[model samples]
Target: EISDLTEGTNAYTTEAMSTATGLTLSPRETPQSVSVVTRQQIEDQGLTDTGAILATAPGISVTRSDSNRYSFSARGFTIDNFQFDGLVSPILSQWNYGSTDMDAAIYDHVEIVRGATGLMTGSGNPSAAVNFVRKRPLREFAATFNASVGSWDYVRGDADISVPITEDGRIRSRLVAAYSQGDLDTRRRTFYGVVSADLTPDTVLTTSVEYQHNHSNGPWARQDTEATTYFVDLTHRFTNDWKLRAAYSHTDGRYLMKHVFSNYDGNLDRDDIHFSLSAPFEAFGLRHEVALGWMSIDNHSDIQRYAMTLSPADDVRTKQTGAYLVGRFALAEPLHLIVGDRWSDWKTKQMYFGSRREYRIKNQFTPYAGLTYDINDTYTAYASYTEIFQPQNARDTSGGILPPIKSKSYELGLKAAYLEGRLNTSAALFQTRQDNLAQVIPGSSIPGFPNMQASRAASGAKVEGIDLEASGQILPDWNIGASYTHFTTKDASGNPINTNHPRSLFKLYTTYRLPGALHRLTVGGGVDWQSRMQDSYALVSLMARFDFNKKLSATLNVNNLRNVMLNLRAQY
Candidate 1:
């Protein structure tokens, strides 16, 4: 799996580029749209938040819902799926929160994969998936400390250190810590802290642990919203070809807002844990890899409204557990096969002041398979079929339980690499049919009733698109990267509720090393364009690093040179 990290390193130029190309070669090299944000880019652009990092990516937009919360959308669909070190974290009304502060400090790089990722993840919408990869321990002892002050009275400091714990340097340890305080547009101040450590040597003894805490004062000028979060994760490498990973996270969030223009308050507390094991082997002269994992999530929410004639308080809780298995095999030098399956168990309980506790349970199973063939060094072809199940967790029109919604998808695509593997391009087409979907009805308050009912009929959807990405040295002193995607998403009823998605999206960025005649400066800028929903926009940034001595350097960064307003509605 480590090889996955190096596959596309030479394919593009820019501080951002991420793909699983080297780890596992898939069929047809499906042109999944991905944006890689590197640490160098983050520092050069002064991006202290996840929103700021993604602001420069194509087909994606961010909006502030409250002082500490933000919403992300891509290709018109809210991004409710997230991965930390390749682990899934799905967000709902009660489980959703922001990962900005954490991403800004602890991660070495971030990758965003656009479109349906049922192939990579067993379940999730077709919108987009965000993955964060943490920094690892180095072989030698090193230390770095940074301090920054920016707009909104933002003050941030980070410290990272790595040391060899063993004489042979085979056993190394690393520690990273960060602290920050800042204000937002709505007069809200935020404070957060995180610390993490990693130990590595023999693949079997490698391990890492991390902890994070955050707190925010209600933004006095905006709606009364406050939140706190605690997160912990642990991973262990059992062998060079096998590993185990696990994590637990808890969040407590509260908000006071207007319901239909009336005063109301809401609170949610959520906890989730995940565990997995992965291994690789050789069988019959073919290389094979397999991963098995389990996950559980528990969520609770409380709501109070005083605007209605009868003030009511509602409480809801849900618990889910799932197991999944995925396998990939290299059948031949130019051919590969992949298969996966997942089983899930879910339960929900809800109650209102005057209502009885409603309970629901559901079980689901999904499976997928794909094939890839290398036509030549520059072109590859592939095809895949997959099925996914998503329960409505609601009732039906006849007051009966509605079966889980299911989707069967078919996909085909091609990929090509050029310029000594500096450029990667791909195109894919897909069609999907969904059954037992939930349909909203005008009025019903039986918990999830009326708001979500099983569809009376099955629905079909189609998505077809082409993605072109080029990165790496475009000129002697210039590094450039670009990504373009064209696709459409539609409902079975042909209603465009997902207008947030764009029909086309494009992003282009470049960094140039200036001549020493002007004092060795590095400059860069980026432009993002999307069709439909909103007009296209652009951002320009400049950065300069001057060497003061062999041991020290001075840096300067100016972001959003255009000072774009970055206005977008909350998709969630």
Candidate 2:
């Protein structure tokens, strides 16, 4: 028999993540500012949705557009690039209904890279990128059930089971189901299943399907939405320890919702494909690593509106394809260099205000460069240069598509791991300069011949920030995580920009296991505070768990004084 040390426990940090690049590397080794919110942390904090997770993650901020719709940003820009298992996909803000608010039950952890990720994602803002990694099938048979009740007639249930289809465990499957209901008749139901098969001793294949339904009567944007996703992944290992990985995913979503004065029906379709080969080779008697990858993304959406005055249905399509090669070179015994380049082709077609429009950018190349040096056994100093390019779909006065926005980003950071990798800490300084930003024309709309599509490109947009974070076990029974961020945004005239985003932010959370007679009890709490943005606010949360035995436990959680939640879990 074997035991997993971190299973059913709390861990704020992970051993390694591949979200920053195609190769798996630890946070201390990766030449970028990175953060990971593990599954144990999610359960300890009692988070229910993806938004709630990001709302508290280090250096990230969330803003609500409607009762159930939210946008996330970091480093003074919106985070438009989101990934599933490290595969790139874009989310449409307007057509979105519960896409970013996905239930957290099926995810193992979330990885955030707070800078430009052009080497992995073909196009996006320089703000950040989020990657959600799903839980995989277990080799052993296991079953777990949980039920919870909270304030406002809130109730929820979750069931998870893992089965071994073959006696030898060569084939396995895991299934998860969850349902929850709260005030105003808001409801969420999700079902997920994944299977894994061993094709050979060195090859494996995994496939998964998931469905979620959400219905809410919130004051704004009352909606009933459904989302379904399918994913396939393959991994193969060679004799030299080199590996090949391939993944594909398709997502389908639809919603029927009512805005303030209009009703809408919308549908979204997106597909992502990724294939890569990573290997380590000897160069001039020194060891190095290289990765080659190809990626493709396709997005299509349609929205129909019903109002007192008939309106044209919106149709949109975006497509992109790219290939990249990255290399990690060992310059010396104490220094390394990482570099990559991506060549992308992007195209967009849309129907706006009853008019057909199209835009395309072909054979555009983006570059990535980074250098790292080991300052000592416990610390590493690094610097990186990254870029982002986005083709604007917005139109100008003459209905001409606006030129693409290009951003140059730079970062310098120091990272350290203490207590033998149990604790991780980082500090960084970063900046981004944006070109050809789209903005509305000041006086273009005059008289009867109004310029509805009036817009212009502006330059000299800049943002700079400082970030600090620490996460891990500080003591045998104590775990803590803390972060602070300060940033400034301005335009060519040096006037402040993005006032809605805070200039300063702070977050802290910790948990402690009781000693002596109360060894079975654990208590934890957290707080988030931010400078005024629309208006500043602070939120606090507390949780306590009591274990009766190896298979049964109960927890109590309170947040904002409105929700007093109690949960019971049992294993079979």
Candidate 3:
């Protein structure tokens, strides 16, 4: 947010990415594999949710269990941590407690880092870090409306309008709303509004209100949810080289029944609040930055029943407070030295049926360091080490809660920012290991407990992978993006930990705009291929959009094209 990034009409880029490190650095300047889904790409392809967008990232895989249920994975670990603007938002990864099927209409872009991202998040996994950047108020007045009708009785409408409340364009407001219903009788609604004001010559303030409601009817389960959020932000610039920024947010979420079920599904709700403050400055010929943050997540739960007894239904609570400081120094002409560490105080409490309260608390320090050397004007080489801690409260065979889970990530990579950050490319090899991952033992010693259920865990596992990717405009009036991913997963005993996910995968999408009178028309197609063992599956896709004028357009998207009951979209 303190710097500038690249711009393009294509799907990829070399641009500003905060997930690599807390520092503001160009994609090539960061020492990790990062990708940005630009606004142009989202609108062109009709990518409406987090799942659809992440599926196209270099090494990510997504699975759909129902119309609104999705799971995302990278390397071999599930991506459980998600950030907004740059702060962590806690969520239940194992249970579908909240709504993760987020609509992308209220966001400007999405940023992703392929490996461990513990520097900004206090607790996490080794898979990846995801951040959603909110849309800002437009400086000029603008209004746009769009509607669509497609197969499966899919119908949708959207409207966006921005206006200036005061002269000089210093005070402005923007509103965005969307409604959609499609196959399986699923429906979704999004409402968002924001206001921006310049409080003084050097101070700025912004506030926003957002709401989302979704309902889906499936064969096995019926689900519905409502979530609302309020956010406020402040920024004060003391100098061109230094600044102060702060943000606060509150969220209330709730979900109802999913059918006659085994899992808890009644009186379900989660309410949480988050706050953060940061400062960036340059001192003594060195670049320095620091941040402080706090989070509290409180959730309600239903009763758990087993052995003809119900575990008391109650509340679950978690609190986390952390701080991190980073510094960048010029070791030489082309070499830069970076060092940082995070201090976290995390505590949590929960209950599982008919038992006493279970608790876990930890105050720990995690260190991160990296080195980046510019090989030339167009290429860069780098190495970094990152680590994080995850609390695991499952009891051992003796009925005592186990220790925490620890992870470490080591990575080496090279990056290319061609055309001055317009087109970006990168290759990376990563080795991430976890210790104390929970594994059930063969037998349960407790006579009252369920058989074959023990909290004992084996030593953790290690995952290794290679990622190769390229993105951005490849030629005049042509856009291209592609990727290749390979994976190796092994437990402590060297046994394969393979799931339905294939070990090797490839994806590509390219589009071209016609010349002259056909300039308003664009056509493209791509392929998603999976192989190696029980895979070898491929899906082909095609898309075309025609513009009647600058303000009206229609799009057709097909899967296995020439195609299956085509989907149509129109905008004005």
Q: List model 1 lDDT by residue over 176-249, tens digit each.
A: 66666665333233433333345554223345555444444431323555556566666677658587767777
Better of 1 and 3 by TM-score: 3
* Residue runs of model 2 more than 4 Å from their true location after superposition: 1-9, 64-69, 95-97, 218-222, 258-262, 308-310, 394-403, 438-458, 493-495, 533-535
lDDT of each: 0.59, 0.82, 0.70
TM-score of structure candidate 2: 0.92
Model 2 clashing residue pairs (backbone)? none
Q: What is the lDDT of residue 427 in candidate 1?
A: 62
Error of 1 at 480 (Å): 2.9
Q: Backbone clash tally for model 2?
A: 0
Every candidate's CA RMSD: 6.5, 3.4, 4.0
Looking at candidate 1, the ten consecutive residues that score lowest on lDDT are 563-572
Between candidates 1 and 2, the one scoring higher on lDDT is 2
What's the distance in Å from true for residue 156, model 2? 1.2
Q: Could you say which candidate leads in TM-score?
A: 2
Model 3, position 495, has a per-residue lDDT of 91
lDDT of 3 by residue, 1-572 (tens): 23333222445564577766677777777777787777666666666666677676667776443453356777776777777777567545422333356777777777888777777777877877877777777777877676767667877777777888887669989898988888858999999899999998788899999888888877266777777778888888776635566777766666653544434344344444444555655666655555444444444444332221244354555666666676666666677767777777776665554544546555667778888899999899999888877888566766666666878888899988777766788888888888777877665455354323456655788888888888888777777778888888888788987655566888887778898988999988788776655647676887888877766777776766134223244332
Candidate 1's displacement at residue 428, Å, is 3.6
Q: Please state the error at residue 380 of candidate 2 in Å.
A: 1.2
